[PDB]
Write an enzyme that holds these catalytic residues in place. Structure first.
Site, short mmCIF file in Angstrom:
data_model
loop_
_atom_site.label_atom_id
_atom_site.label_comp_id
_atom_site.label_asym_id
_atom_site.label_seq_id
_atom_site.Cartn_x
_atom_site.Cartn_y
_atom_site.Cartn_z
N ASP F 44 0.84 -1.18 0.00
CA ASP F 44 0.00 0.00 0.00
C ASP F 44 0.89 1.25 0.00
O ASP F 44 2.10 1.17 -0.21
CB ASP F 44 -0.99 -0.02 1.17
CG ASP F 44 -0.32 0.05 2.53
OD1 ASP F 44 0.90 -0.15 2.64
OD2 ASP F 44 -1.03 0.32 3.52
C1 LIG Z 1 4.61 13.74 16.72
C2 LIG Z 1 3.40 12.95 16.23
C3 LIG Z 1 2.48 13.87 15.44
C4 LIG Z 1 1.24 13.11 15.00
C5 LIG Z 1 1.17 13.07 13.47
C6 LIG Z 1 -0.25 12.80 13.00
C7 LIG Z 1 -0.70 11.40 13.37
C8 LIG Z 1 -2.20 11.29 13.11
C9 LIG Z 1 -2.47 10.11 12.18
C10 LIG Z 1 -3.96 9.78 12.16
C11 LIG Z 1 -4.67 10.72 11.20
C12 LIG Z 1 -5.06 10.00 9.91
O1 LIG Z 1 -5.03 8.82 9.86
S1 LIG Z 1 -5.56 10.96 8.45
C13 LIG Z 1 -6.93 10.12 7.59
C14 LIG Z 1 -6.38 8.96 6.76
N1 LIG Z 1 -7.45 8.07 6.34
C15 LIG Z 1 -8.05 8.24 5.04
O2 LIG Z 1 -7.67 9.10 4.32
C16 LIG Z 1 -9.17 7.31 4.56
C17 LIG Z 1 -8.52 6.28 3.66
N2 LIG Z 1 -8.53 6.76 2.29
C18 LIG Z 1 -7.54 6.48 1.26
O3 LIG Z 1 -7.73 6.97 0.19
C19 LIG Z 1 -6.27 5.60 1.41
O4 LIG Z 1 -6.52 4.39 2.07
C20 LIG Z 1 -5.05 6.32 2.02
C21 LIG Z 1 -4.81 5.85 3.44
C22 LIG Z 1 -5.21 7.84 2.02
C23 LIG Z 1 -3.83 5.98 1.18
O5 LIG Z 1 -3.59 4.61 1.27
P1 LIG Z 1 -3.48 3.73 -0.12
O6 LIG Z 1 -2.96 4.60 -1.23
O7 LIG Z 1 -2.54 2.59 0.09
O8 LIG Z 1 -4.84 3.18 -0.49
#
Ligand SMILES: CCCCCCCCCCCC(=O)SCCNC(=O)CCNC(=O)[C@H](O)C(C)(C)COP(=O)(O)O
Ligand SMILES: CCCCCCCCCCCCCCCCCC(=O)OC[C@H](COP(=O)([O-])OCC(O)COP(=O)([O-])OC[C@@H](COC(=O)CCCCCCCCCCCCCCCCC)OC(=O)CCCCCCCCCCCCCCCCC)OC(=O)CCCCCCCCCCCCCCCCC
Ligand SMILES: CCCCCCCCCCCCCCCCCC(=O)OC[C@H](COP(=O)([O-])OCC(O)COP(=O)([O-])OC[C@@H](COC(=O)CCCCCCCCCCCCCCCCC)OC(=O)CCCCCCCCCCCCCCCCC)OC(=O)CCCCCCCCCCCCCCCCC
Ligand SMILES: CCCCCCCCCCCCCCCCCC(=O)O[C@@H](COC(=O)CCCCCCCCCCCCCCC)COP(=O)(O)OC[C@H](O)CO
Ligand SMILES: CCCCCCCCCCCCCCCCCC(=O)O[C@@H](COC(=O)CCCCCCCCCCCCCCC)COP(=O)(O)OC[C@H](O)CO
Ligand SMILES: CCCCCCCCCCCCCCCCCCCC(=O)O[C@H](COC(=O)CCCCCCCCCCCCCC)COP(=O)(O)OCCN
Ligand SMILES: CCCCCCCCCCCCCCCCCCCC(=O)O[C@H](COC(=O)CCCCCCCCCCCCCC)COP(=O)(O)OCCN
Ligand SMILES: CCCCCCCCCCCCCCCCCCCC(=O)O[C@H](COC(=O)CCCCCCCCCCCCCC)COP(=O)(O)OCCN
Ligand SMILES: CCCCCCCCCCCCCCCCCCCC(=O)O[C@H](COC(=O)CCCCCCCCCCCCCC)COP(=O)(O)OCCN
Ligand SMILES: CCCCCCCCCCCCCCCCCC(=O)OC[C@H](COP(=O)(O)O)OC(=O)CCCCCCCCCCCCCCCCC
Ligand SMILES: CCCCCCCCCCCCCCCCCC(=O)OC[C@H](COP(=O)(O)O)OC(=O)CCCCCCCCCCCCCCCCC
Lengths: 56, 107, 117, 125, 82, 88, 546, 50, 64, 45, 30, 85
Positions: F44
């Site tokens: 991924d």
């Molecule tokens: C010092 C520490 C600071 C903290 C830093 C921030 C930490 C917070 C992390 C949590 C916030 C989130 O998850 S941010 C939100 C993230 N989740 C999404 O976007 C929904 C999924 N949609 C998609 O298009 C894909 O799965 C995608 C994953 C984008 C790409 O992976 P692939 O292309 O393989 O598919």
């Protein structure tokens, strides 16, 4: 977090507790040790009958 | 290649072969990785001239050193300087030029 | 909050840059690399808990909160490899560019080498 | 390792700002402001308001103990008097305003020596 | 050069880097090498520093167990004043 | 040595193939030059972020972010590393 | 022998920068530089034994009169007394080992003989500074080491940050140089001479001690002047060792010890605040050279407080200067060897193990670090404990707070120095370059400074070593407990969760950022006003169109 | 309880714990035994018996 | 552009308008600078005032 | 670094222990009396 | 070091730059 | 300082000028300072063992003066009422 592989005693709970114990004790000795030392210096001579026989 | 390029020194054995540095520029200190051919002879001659300067400044220093107090014992400047006064120790007693107590209180 | 460059990115590359910068900031705040490994694993598990989302509002809220966290925890002394920009060995002894030479300039057109009046 | 690669800085290809001499362009990438932190983002994204706000507490936290001891504590806290000297030795030693022998509260001229150790700035006429 | 050799991709170790003089661990080989000048100078200077510390600590051990006050007060009370 | 500041293609290929195989889901027999990270290997986006950071560690590089976005296959990584004068 | 300690490093610099060096090359210039320092060190050893032990000062009229208009009389004259002999021994002995190190450290530099000539010039101007008998030849030495510091900090001139660090050092020191010049004017006006032996002040006009203190705070990098010291790490490692050990930063402390015309409140407050500030600054850095730079600033604070205490405190201040130079130069040389063994990396998160360095580099770092943290019966133990015990019995109530600040600083120093050892050697490996250096010249350079560390224990700096200032066992052995507390905390590697305090301290209290706009941007804007609104505007007279 | 997700870093960098890359405790204090033996010899020579 | 894939490109531009500081900020910082860097002037003016007020007290209580 | 609760607990325990030691230090005999009693104890050996 | 030691011969012959940009023409004096 | 008066000076001005005693060391233990300085400045590296007696005697004299200084401070505070009698 793991300790270094050649010094695993540094990650022990007893070592961290002892380091905290010594550090806190020395930090408060910093603030308390000045008037206690001054009182000890005064009491060296205050209780001397060769200087102050009234205080014995 | 330009006409004057044959008159120029090559890049020395100290310089990395891929480093470029414009060999036409005259640097007052020598420049990029300077390594002249007769350098050991030049080093010996410059060491000789430095020794001449060392003797000259040693003589000038010895001629112009002023000691307003006598030393408290033997100092190594007694060997080469005749203006060094006789030592007078910590009790005020006059001493010999070799730093020993004179007769009457010695041994 | 992200910069104007990161706000212009596509969503996939935006999340990828957020994970990459989080891993790098965890390197900067750690004492060693062996301290960094389980923090890297924990950050990876943190991103895996939002992978299966679909609501774009919840995605936007989580993304914006994480970008605020990364703007908060930007290290004042980042770890840069020395021979790159911001490193300690960048731009020290570069090779000279070719500079042109004029031989015997004083000997060319003597008696007429001043300023006109 | 001399001769490492380094990226060059581009030349201006647009109209220049009026006060352009606040950027230092030495020929390589990147240039810098004429003085660091005068503009651009500060390290750690901190701001001037951050430092002034933390300093408005931290400065009085450092100036607090000096004021307390200089106004609420005196020479008599010590368990001993300063080092004692014969009169011919002491009388020149306490002529210095710098000296720590003016804190001898057992001296017969303690007040007069303290009154002579007041710092002046303009020499009077 | 660099003091360790790396292997990559499960390759065999080159035959010049095998024997009783080399140590391989997880695909990285290093050489057990003894340096004489470094070892002798470090041991000599370290022994000098250890003796300098221990001798001067031994000369002042009584003033370090007790303080100045106790040591000199015992000296006054036991062995006279003037 | 060899090359005008650039590493040879074969050793770069060997090192990239070594770095790529450090996943649990990866079958080792599918790892080849010019193999796609997502379609062919089954990684991924987060796995690709970790792989590019590991290649940064392997070749001692500070890869700029826009360049790390473009890397999407083994051959892309090999071609990028062979164009670095700073790759060690 | 007396003039050979001053002239002869200047001669080595003149040889290695002139067109004579075009005939010697790198190989011949290294020989010339090392020999020209060995001769000066031998001369300084003879001077030290004659003046310190046998008590016979020597005054030399070198080049006649410099300039003499009215009653302002400046002569080219030296005087070699106790302080001068102490300083000459220290400067030449440190600079000899730094030259022996630099002839191997900068071997792959393209302009090696130019670097060696700059090092020799810097050493020679320091010798001129301490050998002078009046204030104006001292100012020759002051500005000479300033100029050579500019040339050596910005040596790698193709790097912009190095150029800006050198310019910053010049400008920050130029403010204090102006105040020092005005103080010299005050001193000459109200005493009638410039020679040190005729400057005996009991009660002067306040501006004298204040302006001379500000001029000393510039060179010794005290509070609100320390900002140039950390950025001076842009220069190569021998430059940093010679700046932080023998030249430059010890010049202001030497000047205040020599003159003894200060007012003690300012001196004690500035010194103790500097010591605490640089202690907390160095506890939160990860650059290997910046931690050592901040420890230098902290020890200069200790010496400032000591010379505030009194004449005995002035002697203890000179003693701590003399013992500090040896282990500080040793620390910088060992750090340079560790950096070169790890591919040029300066971050302590990318070290570990005992493969990237020689056995002697690790021993040098260990012994100099133990002397710095006041481990018992090593070199720094005697001088630092003397200053601490003298501060515990001062009758000024201001010195009560200063002593507490010094004890907190001592614990912080034993924390971050132990952290420097722990990260470098004890933890697991986290770099990728192992090229350990085992050349003869840098190892002998480190061994000489370790020999001087042993010499300071065996033969003291002055008569204070062994004198007992009568303190209880609780007051006396507390700094040992603070050293142990720092060691235990740093080996436990514990951290706090108060991240805003961590980033306030690690960003070094924002002094540079606040200075970037409190004087600097206003100076630029006032220049804009004076040019555009004044010269082109209000005062401009136009043409008459016809 | 999964933690082996996303590029196994311990396996890739398991060479960091090479025995020749670790801290060596055999030569951690060079010469200290020699200085201690010389100190003991001096004490027996000078202070205990005479 | 031969090193843009190694050290970064020229696409990101500096965010600064090269404009002068605000008038009140400049005035306040200049007044603080005058107070800090010209403190002997204020010290000597205060000395003159403290000296002349004492002579005022002497001349007041003397002629009574 | 390492965020340790054992170290944090040790800090407060050490503050308490050295407060008790400081109280014991305040109520100690004079050094004159301590030296005199120690010399009297040694004189019966 | 060239030759395998610090104490070998130097490796440069000829002009190490031209002082004042003056190049000798046909070996003639300037 | 009348209750605890100073002892007589055993070193003259000429003796302290001959030993070049620093003027802030010219107190009521100046003769012991002269002995200690004379021993140490001529004993070289091994001064701690062959000048142990002179240093010990000098520190003993300074201990006597330290005790007198404590006693003077106690008497002054008793006279001012700061310490109850
Ligand atoms: C010092 C520490 C600071 C903290 C830093 C921030 C930490 C917070 C992390 C949590 C916030 C989130 O998850 S941010 C939100 C993230 N989740 C999404 O976007 C929904 C999924 N949609 C998609 O298009 C894909 O799965 C995608 C994953 C984008 C790409 O992976 P692939 O292309 O393989 O598919
Ligand atoms: C120096 C380094 C600079 C940056 C680090 C900041 C350290 C500041 C701090 O307070 O850290 C304590 C910090 C505790 O913070 P924490 O562990 O994140 O919080 C406590 C726990 O949540 C829970 O812990 P707990 O509740 O069990 O108790 C621990 C804590 C009390 O924790 C509390 O509950 C806080 C309540 C406050 C009053 C008690 O105890 C104390 O701090 C008491 C004094 C000792 O100690 C450490 O664990 C770090 C040790 C490293 C060295 C610090 C030792 C003291 C140094 C003294 C000189 C100070 C120099 C700094 C100047 C300031 C500018
Ligand atoms: C009768 C005058 C003849 C001698 C001068 C001459 O030939 O001027 C021709 C020339 C005529 O030029 P223009 O193209 O007609 O422009 C007239 C001004 O630029 C007018 O431009 P403005 O709007 O800036 O003028 C207002 C003027 C305010 O005007 C005044 O201050 C006039 C008061 C002058 C009486 C003397 C007291 O303020 C200033 O320019 C700055 C303050 C002047 C001090 O006058 C000037 O270059 C300006 C004269 C200002 C005199 C002060 C110069 C400062 C040094
Ligand atoms: C009176 C003064 C007169 C001049 C004295 C100074 C000249 C001595 C230093 C000579 C130049 C140093 C550089 C040098 O010689 O480099 C070599 C280092 O030489 C040494 O062994 C060290 C120098 C001699 C010892 C140090 C002398 C300096 C003086 C201070 C002594 C203090 C004790 C390089 O190694 P190598 O040639 O031994 O090995 C060759 C290599 O392995 C194969 O390529
Ligand atoms: C003999 C005089 C010095 C000749 C050196 C000239 C030189 O090297 O030119 C440089 C021109 O730069 C200068 O302007 C240097 C001026 C040198 C000044 C000489 C004096 C040195 C001692 C200072 C004392 C001055 C008086 C002090 C008064 C208080 C350019 O350097 P480069 O290209 O040769 O090598 C640069 C490399 O990267 C390191 O910088
Ligand atoms: C009326 C008299 C006013 C007296 C004060 C005037 C100060 C004017 C400074 C002008 C600076 C112009 C040149 C310039 O920006 O150079 C920078 C120097 O910074 C600096 O000079 C920054 C430090 C400024 C501190 C000034 C006061 C110090 C003493 C406090 C009292 C470069 O250096 P850089 O800042 O980019 O350094 C980068 C290394 N990292
Ligand atoms: C771009 C910046 C470069 C910086 C350069 C280094 C820094 C220099 C700073 C100070 C410069 C001062 C130079 C002064 C030059 C001569 C001035 C004196 C002229 C003169 O006739 O005086 C006589 C000349 O003596 C003598 O000169 C001695 C006689 C010859 C014996 C020693 C020979 C000198 C050896 C020096 C080695 C290298 C040293 C490098 C400085 C001495 O007699 P007087 O009339 O003054 O009478 C009084 C005592 N008798
Ligand atoms: C476990 C943590 C405890 C922290 C304190 C350090 C160990 C001291 C043990 C103790 O109780 O000693 C007292 C020291 O207190 C005192 O009177 C001295 C207080 C200040 C000492 C701080 C430095 C300790 C040395 C490291 C009694 O002292 P004692 O009756 O044994 O003393 C005369 C013999 N020498
Ligand atoms: C507290 C207040 C203190 C006040 C202190 C003030 C100090 C004085 C400051 C200014 C002093 C200098 C005065 C002359 C400045 C001249 C500036 C440049 C003028 C210039 O370029 O000259 C011509 C244009 O102006 C001209 O033609 C200029 C003509 C000469 C100007 C002055 C004479 C004006 C007439 C005299 C009577 C004035 C009235 C008296 C009530 C060029 O012309 P071109 O040859 O290129 O063009 C010919 C085609 N037509
Ligand atoms: C420079 C440091 C000054 C500080 C001095 C602190 C006190 C030193 C004396 C205490 C050490 C006594 C050592 C007793 C025998 C242990 C083995 C030994 O030293 O030889 C092995 C070896 C050194 O053998 P050498 O290099 O042949 O002298 O020591 C170590 O590697 C460390 C073990 C001894 C010190 C830690 C306890
Ligand atoms: C705009 C700035 C430029 C002008 C400066 C202030 C104007 C001075 C001239 C008017 C007063 C002349 C006084 C004459 C005299 O001898 O009377 C003394 C007069 C005599 O007292 P009397 O004999 O009891 O009446 O009073 C004094 O001794 C004290 C008064 C001092 C002089 C006036 C106040 C000046 C304060 C300093 C200037 C302000 C600085 C601004 C920046 C602050 C820092 C940011």
């Amino acid at each position: 977090v793991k300790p270094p592989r050649v010094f695993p005693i540094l990650g022990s709970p007893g070592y961290q507790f002892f380091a905290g114990l010594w550090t806190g004790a020395m930090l408060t000795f910093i603030f308390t040790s000045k008037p206690l030392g001054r009182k000890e210096v005064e009491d060296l001579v205050k209780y001397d009958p060769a200087y102050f026989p009234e205080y014995a | 290649e330009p006409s004057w390029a044959k008159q120029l020194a090559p890049k020395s054995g100290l310089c990395p072969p891929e480093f470029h540095y414009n060999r036409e520029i005259w640097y007052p200190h020598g420049g990029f990785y300077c390594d002249p051919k007769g350098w050991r002879k030049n080093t010996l001659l410059t060491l000789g001239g430095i020794g001449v300067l060392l003797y000259m400044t040693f003589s000038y220093s010895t001629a112009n050193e002023v000691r307003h107090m006598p030393p408290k014992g033997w100092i190594p400047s007694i060997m080469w300087n005749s203006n060094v006064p006789d030592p007078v120790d910590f009790r005020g007693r006059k001493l010999n030029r070799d730093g020993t107590l004179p007769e009457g209180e010695s041994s | 909050m992200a910069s104007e460059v990161v706000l212009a990115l596509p969503h996939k590359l935006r999340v990828m840059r957020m994970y990459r910068t989080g891993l790098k900031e965890l390197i900067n705040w750690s004492a060693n690399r062996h301290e960094w490994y389980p923090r890297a694993y924990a950050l990876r598990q943190e991103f895996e808990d939002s992978k299966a989302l679909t609501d774009r509002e919840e995605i936007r809220k989580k993304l914006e909160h994480g970008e605020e966290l990364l703007a908060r925890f930007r290290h004042w002394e980042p770890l840069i490899k020395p021979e790159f920009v911001g490193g300690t060995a960048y731009s020290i002894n570069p090779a000279q560019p070719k500079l042109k030479f004029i031989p015997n300039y004083d000997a060319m057109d003597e008696y007429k080498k001043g300023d006109h009046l | 390792g001399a001769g490492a690669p380094v990226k060059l800085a581009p030349r201006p290809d647009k109209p220049l700002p009026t006060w352009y001499e606040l950027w230092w362009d030495n020929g390589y990438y990147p240039g810098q402001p004429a003085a660091d932190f005068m503009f651009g983002a500060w390290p750690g994204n901190m701001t001037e308001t951050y430092y002034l706000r933390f300093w408005s507490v931290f400065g009085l936290a450092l100036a607090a103990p000096f004021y307390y001891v200089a106004n609420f504590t005196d020479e008599t806290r010590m368990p001993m008097v300063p080092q004692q000297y014969p009169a011919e030795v002491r009388d020149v030693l306490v002529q210095r305003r710098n000296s720590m022998l003016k804190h001898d509260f057992s001296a017969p001229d303690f007040k007069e020596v303290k009154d002579r150790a007041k710092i002046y700035w303009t020499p009077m006429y | 050069a660099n003091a360790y050799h790396r292997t990559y991709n499960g390759k065999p170790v080159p035959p010049e880097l095998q024997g009783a003089d080399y140590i391989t661990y997880a695909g990285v080989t290093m050489k057990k090498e003894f340096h004489l000048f470094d070892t002798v100078l470090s041991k000599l200077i370290g022994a000098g520093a250890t003796f300098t510390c221990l001798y001067h600590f031994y000369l002042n051990a009584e003033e370090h167990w007790h303080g100045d006050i106790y040591f000199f007060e015992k000296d006054v009370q036991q062995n006279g004043w003037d | 040595g060899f090359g005008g500041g650039f590493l040879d293609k074969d050793s770069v290929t060997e090192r990239v193939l070594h770095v790529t195989k450090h996943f649990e889901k990866i079958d080792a027999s599918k790892v080849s030059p010019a193999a796609s990270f997502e379609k062919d290997l089954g990684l991924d986006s987060l796995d690709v972020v970790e792989l590019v950071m590991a290649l940064e560690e392997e070749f001692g590089l500070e890869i700029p972010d826009a360049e790390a976005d473009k890397i999407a296959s083994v051959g892309d990584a090999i071609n990028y590393i062979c164009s670095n004068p700073m790759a060690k | 022998m007396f003039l050979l300690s001053v002239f002869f490093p200047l001669l080595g610099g003149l040889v290695n920068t002139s067109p004579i060096a075009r005939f010697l090359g790198h190989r011949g210039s290294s020989i010339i530089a090392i020999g020209c320092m060995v001769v000066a060190f031998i001369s300084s050893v003879v001077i030290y034994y004659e003046v310190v032990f046998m008590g016979c000062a020597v005054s030399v009229d070198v080049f006649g009169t410099w300039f003499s208009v009215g009653t302002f009389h400046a002569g080219w004259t030296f005087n070699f007394d106790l302080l001068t002999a102490n300083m000459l021994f220290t400067v030449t002995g440190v600079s000899m080992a730094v030259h022996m190190y630099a002839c191997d450290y900068m071997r792959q530099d393209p302009h090696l003989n130019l670097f060696l000539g700059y090092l020799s010039y810097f050493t020679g101007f320091m010798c001129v500074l301490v050998a002078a008998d009046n204030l104006l030849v001292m100012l020759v030495g002051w500005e000479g080491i300033g100029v050579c510091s500019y040339l050596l900090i910005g040596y790698w001139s193709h790097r912009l940050s190095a150029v800006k660090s050198a310019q910053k050092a010049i400008l920050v020191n130029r403010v204090s140089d102006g105040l020092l010049m005005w103080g010299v004017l005050w001193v000459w006006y109200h005493l009638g001479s410039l020679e040190y032996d005729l400057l005996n002040v009991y009660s002067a006009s306040g501006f004298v001690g204040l302006s001379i203190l500000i001029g000393a705070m510039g060179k010794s990098a005290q509070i609100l002047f320390h900002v140039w010291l950390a950025d001076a790490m842009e220069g190569p490692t021998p430059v940093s060792a010679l700046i932080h050990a023998a030249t430059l930063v010890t010049a202001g402390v030497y000047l205040l010890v020599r003159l003894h015309i200060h007012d003690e409140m300012f001196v004690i407050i500035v010194g103790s605040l500097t010591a605490f500030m640089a202690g907390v600054f160095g506890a939160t850095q990860s650059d290997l050279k910046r931690v050592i730079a901040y420890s230098t600033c902290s020890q200069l604070g200790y010496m400032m407080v000591s010379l505030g205490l009194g004449e005995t405190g002035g002697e203890a201040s000179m003693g701590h200067l003399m013992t500090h130079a040896s282990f500080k130069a040793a620390l910088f040389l060992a750090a340079g060897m560790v950096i070169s063994g790890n591919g040029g990396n300066q971050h302590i998160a990318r070290y570990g193990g005992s493969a990237h360095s020689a056995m002697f580099t690790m021993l040098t770092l260990m012994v100099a670090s133990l002397s710095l943290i006041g481990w018992p019966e090593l070199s720094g133990f005697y001088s630092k404990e003397t200053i601490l015990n003298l501060a515990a019995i001062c009758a000024d109530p201001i010195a009560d707070v200063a002593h507490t600040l010094l004890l907190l600083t001592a614990m912080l120093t034993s924390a971050y120095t132990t952290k420097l050892f722990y990260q470098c050697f004890m933890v697991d490996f986290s770099g990728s370059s192992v090229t350990p250096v085992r050349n003869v010249l840098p190892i002998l350079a480190m061994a000489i400074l370790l020999l001087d560390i042993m010499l300071k224990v065996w033969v003291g700096t002055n008569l204070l070593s062994g004198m007992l200032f009568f303190l209880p066992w609780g007051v006396k052995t507390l700094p040992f407990g603070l050293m142990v507390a720092g060691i235990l905390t740093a080996t436990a590697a514990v951290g706090s969760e108060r991240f805003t305090l961590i980033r306030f301290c690690g960003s070094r209290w924002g002094f540079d950022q606040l200075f970037a706009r409190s004087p600097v941007n206003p100076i630029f804007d006032l220049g804009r006003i004076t040019w555009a609104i004044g010269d082109r505007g209000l005062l401009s007279v136009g043409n008459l169109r016809a | 309880m999964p933690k082996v997700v996303g590029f196994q870093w311990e396996r890739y960098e398991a060479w960091r714990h090479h025995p020749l890359l670790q801290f060596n405790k055999r030569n951690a204090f060079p010469g200290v035994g020699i200085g201690f033996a010389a100190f003991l010899a001096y004490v027996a020579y000078d202070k205990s018996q005479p | 552009t031969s090193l843009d894939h190694v050290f970064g490109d020229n696409s990101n531009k500096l965010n600064y308008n090269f404009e002068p500081m605000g008038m009140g900020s400049l005035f306040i910082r200049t007044m603080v600078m005058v107070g800090v860097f010209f403190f002997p002037v204020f010290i000597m003016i205060n000395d003159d005032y403290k000296y002349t007020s004492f002579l005022d007290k002497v001349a007041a209580a003397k002629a009574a | 670094g390492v965020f340790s609760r054992y170290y944090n607990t040790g800090l407060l325990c050490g503050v308490a222990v050295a407060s008790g030691i400081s109280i014991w230090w305040y109520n100690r005999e004079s050094i004159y009396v301590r030296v005199k009693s120690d010399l009297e104890k040694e004189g019966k050996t | 070091y060239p030759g395998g030691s610090f104490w070998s011969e130097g490796t440069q012959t000829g002009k190490n730059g031209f002082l004042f940009g003056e190049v000798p023409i046909n070996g003639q004096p300037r | 300082a009348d209750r605890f008066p100073p002892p007589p000076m055993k070193a003259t001005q000429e003796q302290m000028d001959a030993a070049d005693v620093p003027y802030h060391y010219r107190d009521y233990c100046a003769h012991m300072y002269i002995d200690y300085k004379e021993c140490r400045l001529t004993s070289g590296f091994s001064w701690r063992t062959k000048c142990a007696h002179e240093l010990h005697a000098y520190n003993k004299c300074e201990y006597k003066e330290f005790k007198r200084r404590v006693a003077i401070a106690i008497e002054e505070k008793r006279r001012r009422g700061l310490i109850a009698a």
